[PDB]
Ligand binder design. Structure first.
Ligand SMILES: C[C@H](CCc1ccc(O)cc1)NC(=O)Cc1c(-c2ccccc2)[nH]c2cc(OCCN3CCCCC3)ccc12
Ligand SMILES: C[C@H](CCc1ccc(O)cc1)NC(=O)Cc1c(-c2ccccc2)[nH]c2cc(OCCN3CCCCC3)ccc12
Lengths: 243, 243
């Protein structure tokens, strides 16, 4: 009982900010660790992602455990679609941050990184070619959050089935919202279903990139101590005291 | 210039056969290597997948190199959606072959395997819940073949761009075909776009499962000698002599 334009406005209002890379811009770059740069940016974006996630319509009606599970599952996909989105207008570069716009050569210092840079760049080029709009982008990122882990709840409890039912209902509303957007934009019925499919097929590519990067993650340094699940739980298990 | 019902019939006619597991059914099962069973079945299904792939409308108009690249990319996803499809009517089991229907316990002998069994079972349950039809299934498997590697062509040649253009056009026709199917089935316009989205979001899960299994593949025994690319090329680089 949210309309389409309500859902769009809600998602647009919940958008997280664009963070800066923390390096000293007054000192030489070759001293910079790209894995430290990425690790430190990603850790800071994560805190803002939890706050975004709570403002996605339907998300907080889920159990805490299910909220954690969706985010644990989708966090890198969600970082990556935000990255490809802000890179759209910067052909051949990735806009990690407004003070950190890298080309593929700047990924070659880390084993396996340039392959993921090449995939991200390719995905950003496809959004450019499709002329992805800001309204469509926030619907897609919401879908990733709700869809990516919904099939790995290891649960068949009644509660679990009620949760899955609700998620599938929210996802159906976002679908309606995407379609509303395109119709408003002047697309034919046929063009509408064609573009919905083009947009959702990109999500398979974003999953692919996430998996490939997670692979290099749980070897390569970073943050691995204190399981991600309980960190999410602490961030998610909020009190109501700062009301 | 293929209609929707033409495309459905074509895809239905191109379907590969259902293969049997080769073990001696007269000898004890604990002697059986599940990784050998899977390896040997998957290797035999691969040969039939190449022949299916050539009968997917639009596929053979691609360059040989691009055909190889799509299959190298999508072969495990394509095996997995066929598996979840034939398992649909066998709750709690995976129908690897008509003489090889396994439950999750039968995957616990291999490190990491039961997790992938659990994901496949969950995906087959979702197809059951949606009542996936045979016509929809062959469209989805065709989409996986054409979509999964189209963004990792490392190419911007004119030829490459023409290829990408054609693939995106074939994918748009299959989209039209899915929609045709549902309209025929009596779904409302709204239900049609909702179900198209539900179906394509499952493809993100199938990608996930493929990636996770490939991870355990390129450590675990199997077939790894003589790069998959050249094997695909030999199977794909056919003569016309048996005309
Ligand atoms: C090139 C991509 C860029 C990922 C990325 C980061 C931030 C963005 O806003 C968008 C996209 N990296 C990966 O796909 C995987 C990866 C690598 C990597 C890739 C190739 C070779 C070697 C290393 N290091 C990290 C560090 C990290 O952040 C720190 C880990 N924290 C993050 C928050 C969640 C808990 C773990 C998150 C992802 C990655
Ligand atoms: C449980 C799944 C089942 C995969 C599968 C096989 C056949 C089907 O028809 C459907 C699905 N396995 C995997 O996801 C990955 C995998 C493992 C595995 C999973 C967990 C732990 C350990 C091992 N061994 C093999 C062997 C193989 O086939 C042989 C390799 N050939 C196949 C043809 C392409 C060249 C390589 C293909 C896939 C897999």
């Amino acid at each position: 009982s949210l309309t389409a334009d309500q859902m769009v406005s809600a998602l647009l209002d919940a958008e997280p900010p664009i963070l800066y890379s923390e390096y000293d811009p007054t000192r030489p770059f070759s001293e910079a660790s790209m894995m430290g740069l990425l690790t430190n940016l990603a850790d800071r974006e994560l805190v803002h992602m939890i706050n975004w996630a709570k403002r996605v319509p339907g998300f907080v009606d889920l159990t805490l455990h299910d909220q954690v599970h969706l985010l644990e599952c989708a966090w890198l996909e969600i970082l990556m679609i935000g990255l490809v989105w802000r890179s759209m207008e910067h052909p051949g570069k990735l806009l990690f941050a407004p003070n950190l716009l890298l080309d593929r050569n700047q990924g070659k210092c880390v084993e396996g990184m340039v392959e993921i840079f090449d995939m991200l760049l390719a995905t950003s080029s496809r959004f450019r070619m499709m002329n992805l709009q800001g309204e469509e982008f926030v619907c897609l990122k919401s879908i990733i959050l709700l869809n990516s882990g919904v099939y790995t709840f290891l649960s068949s409890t009644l509660k679990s089935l009620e949760e899955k039912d609700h998620i599938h209902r929210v996802l159906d509303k976002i679908t309606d919202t995407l379609i509303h957007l395109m119709a408003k934009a002047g697309l034919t019925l046929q063009q509408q279903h064609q573009r919905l499919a083009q947009l959702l097929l990109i999500l398979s590519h974003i999953r692919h990139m996430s998996n490939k990067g997670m692979e290099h993650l749980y070897s390569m340094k970073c943050k691995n101590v204190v399981p991600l699940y309980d960190l999410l739980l602490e961030m998610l298990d909020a009190h109501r005291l700062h009301a």
